[PDB]
What we know:
4 copies of one chain form a homotetramer. The first copy, chain A, is α/β, with parallel strands linked by helices. Chain A has one domain (1-247): Rossmann fold (3-Layer(aba) Sandwich), CATH 3.40.50. Chain A has helices spanning 19-29, 43-50, 66-76, 102-105, 108-129, 157-175, 194-200, 209-218, and strands at 7-10, 33-38, 57-60, 85-88, 139-145, 182-188, 231-234. Chain A has a 7-stranded parallel β-sheet with strand order 3-2-1-4-5-6-7, with helices on both faces. At the A-B interface, helix 4, helix 5 and helix 6 of A face helix 4, helix 5 and helix 6 of B. Strand 8 (252-255) of chain B pairs parallel with strand 8 of chain D, so a sheet runs across the interface. Bound molecules: nicotinamide-adenine-dinucleotide (NAD). The PDB classes it as oxidoreductase. Keywords: oxidoreductase, fatty acid biosynthesis. It forms a tetrameric assembly. Crystal structure of Francisella tularensis enoyl reductase (ftFabI) with bound NAD.
Amino acid sequence: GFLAGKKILITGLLSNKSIAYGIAKAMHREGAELAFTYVGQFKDRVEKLCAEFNPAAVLPCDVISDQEIKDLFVELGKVWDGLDAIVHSIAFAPRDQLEGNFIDCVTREGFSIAHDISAYSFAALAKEGRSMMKNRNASMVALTYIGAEKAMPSYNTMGVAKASLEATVRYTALALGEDGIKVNAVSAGPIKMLDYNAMVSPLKKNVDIMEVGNTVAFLCSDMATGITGEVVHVDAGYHCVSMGNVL
Amino acid sequence: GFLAGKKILITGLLSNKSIAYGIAKAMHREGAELAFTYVGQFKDRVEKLCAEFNPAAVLPCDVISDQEIKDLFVELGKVWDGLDAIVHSIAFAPRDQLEGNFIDCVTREGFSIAHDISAYSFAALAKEGRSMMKNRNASMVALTYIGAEKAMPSYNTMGVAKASLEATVRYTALALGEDGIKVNAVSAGPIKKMLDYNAMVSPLKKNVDIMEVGNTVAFLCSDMATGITGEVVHVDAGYHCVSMGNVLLEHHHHHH
Amino acid sequence: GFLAGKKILITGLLSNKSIAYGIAKAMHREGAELAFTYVGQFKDRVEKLCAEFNPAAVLPCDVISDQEIKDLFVELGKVWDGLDAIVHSIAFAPRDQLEGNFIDCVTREGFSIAHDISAYSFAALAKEGRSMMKNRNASMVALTYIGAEKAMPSYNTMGVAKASLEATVRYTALALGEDGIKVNAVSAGPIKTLMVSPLKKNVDIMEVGNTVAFLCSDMATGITGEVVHVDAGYHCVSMGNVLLEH
Amino acid sequence: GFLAGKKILITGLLSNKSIAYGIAKAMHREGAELAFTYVGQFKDRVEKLCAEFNPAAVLPCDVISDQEIKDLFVELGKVWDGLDAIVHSIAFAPRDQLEGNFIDCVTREGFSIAHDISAYSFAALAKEGRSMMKNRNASMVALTYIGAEKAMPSYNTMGVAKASLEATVRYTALALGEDGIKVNAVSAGPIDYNAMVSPLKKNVDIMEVGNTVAFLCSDMATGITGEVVHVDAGYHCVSMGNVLLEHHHHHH
Ligand SMILES: NC(=O)c1ccc[n+]([C@@H]2O[C@H](COP(=O)([O-])OP(=O)(O)OC[C@H]3O[C@@H](n4cnc5c(N)ncnc54)[C@H](O)[C@@H]3O)[C@@H](O)[C@H]2O)c1
């Protein structure tokens, strides 16, 4: 596999259908070495889930907590020499933020909660895994979405938070370059308005967890060492089109 | 004046040199009626600074506080039937955010404050101004910078908070669209620290000035601009549209 | 008005409903002196058409012919001692390019012609016009459409041409900045159809006009190489409705 | 090899420093069968360069000639069941278009010559080779350069063309996706101070580009279409120039 022997930390694995899952699957296939984080009272749920990947570790990480992000690596450091990739599939906004007119919805707290879990956490990860990622063609990937680039209905505060992430990828790309660490993002399409997508986008379909999963994998390999600060769209083409109405 | 009779509220006015000043100077020339805000103990400084614009009111609004933002409009509403524009010229990041490698500097608290002040506050003003701005080809404008788009040494988390601002600007464009409110932003180049680089690479071979920025905020608050929303206009001497690397200045020295 | 005494060349006035007529109406109101180009056997229709703007000149110009473009300015230089702006509102693609699957329709010639009239002719105008535009905060503005930025059904070859056109804008901006000539483009949303954008309407020829006017004004001397969408926010939004029929 | 048994066609291999050489190495390592184009008398040259990849075919193609392009696909059609990918690494501008102030240089003939070879030819290839690619998760990749997005000195007409190419990539993507064809582009960095400004502080090398282009013709890349992927040490995502001084010292 094009990821043989590399050590990768995969965040965001919650279910059978998680993008993070497609990622794990692609990576395991390419023979990487894998570790997983869970939030809250899902210790159970995820270790069951990721058993098939022969995990090096399954460790708590609520990116709300600074001490938890520290410990995550202190404990990872008991299992690994260093670290090759960090994959970042983390996002969240309160409900109240996510359903209605955006300026009706938006509240100070929601804005900073959403930004904190969805954008900063990526940098916070880069900070604490850096020391074990130096000079090894190390890679970092985030999961993002076109609501960053373009305003949409009800994506709301989440779209803003995503734009925030994208900016953060670019600054991390520059901060971590000297250390030879690439930083990039995959922009997925939806996995109930995936209908629109399937009708408009040139490839006439929604994408699946394997297509994204493989892109994220490719982006943590030695083939992708010329790329950094980049948003790759894995969205059947949706991004490069501008129809309006369909019937 | 193309802004005649319009009631426009200006934020971020701190000095002679402030972008808001350029804005105001422009807006005043075009017959706008203007209000002003201040943060902290600047009632006097700012009252004396904006006397020349014959303000309708000068009002406390630290954008940190939900109460100050609500009380802003309750007050503004005592003097002004309704409201036409809001100019958002507000940026903050803790200095600890701005000195060196971005990953070295960035903190949860820094990131938080940065976005709170630099981006959220825009939506907050939209939230509390909205009712005063219903049905009058009303306008909001925000101020931004290319660091939103592309990474740079030092600008760091301010670069992110600006990207968050621009995203905020667009969502607001969609959200107040229904209420006839256009929402746009001006990306301004540096104003007299690397001005030099800007002035050497940029097509028009200069730095911009506050008039040049002011004049464009003016326009985007005019009935002439009512087809433009969610937009980022660069008033930056052309810097955005160009891709060079290092130029090569030639410093002469004389030693006696 | 903010265009008082400025001398502006407007291309592509063909109709009572042309964008260039909105531009004209706007610029004239803002106190500019104006000159207009016509094509072939249309001298008279364009003469009747711009009478209301008290034109300084009505001169032939088929942007196909270098000779015609050189001749425009030679003749324009006889009436004016310098030029303040050029308005580039010219677009053409052969009909067979514009209707169907792009890879089905596209031809070498169509590709050639569309780019020639739609994109290059901007550079040609800059090139011949330049010497009368030096050091007076002069301006060039092209009309463009989001079909350049993103692929659309039927717009096809035109979309690529408009793309070529917005690069022509950028390079010109860089090439002519050193003379104070600001070079910019307005991406115009369509005027009519026969819902999507945040303003929930179609922009009209005045809104487009007033922006082109402002982009030839002294107020916009710090703006160049830029695209300004006057399209009611369409560019910044990504909702397509599906339309069910029951 | 992630490209095993895919039939791919490679244009614009003119020497062993060509991007198309990087692509070829990448693709052959990934187990693809490859065919190559050449213009004019360069049959011999190109047959030598690529001999090492056991070309499935080596065939003439001047992208200026409609008829050469037709024959390209007629003949390739005799050798192959169908076709999996086309790699477009072809650019040309007249010399007079590239050495000065854009507006002084640019000409009607130049502008259109530049667009025909550098931009049209892509659609042109798509057109005539479409039929062999129908429904087999087939792919097209173009090579572009960041001067499509921004202006550089003297890249002039080429930057316009490359911009035009990039739109064509977008339209081809929509024209052809109904047949399952991905249509993308790699904006390569130059292979200096792109080595001083880029976050990764280096010039990307043909393998780094080749490997990417290969990936864009792998079955792993089936949800990516109409994209432009920068393989440029991160130069695109940055605004990082600074004024470099030379010191002149005069005594007394
Ligand atoms: N689901 C889709 O169809 C779709 C489409 C486009 C983009 N995305 C992207 O999907 C990514 C998320 O993955 P998903 O689609 O599998 O479901 P999701 O967006 O509902 O899951 C979010 C993940 O964040 C984790 N998480 C939330 N808060 C956390 C915290 N405080 N600390 C640690 N972890 C936390 C959760 O466990 C969950 O696995 C998001 O980053 C989003 O950008 C998803």
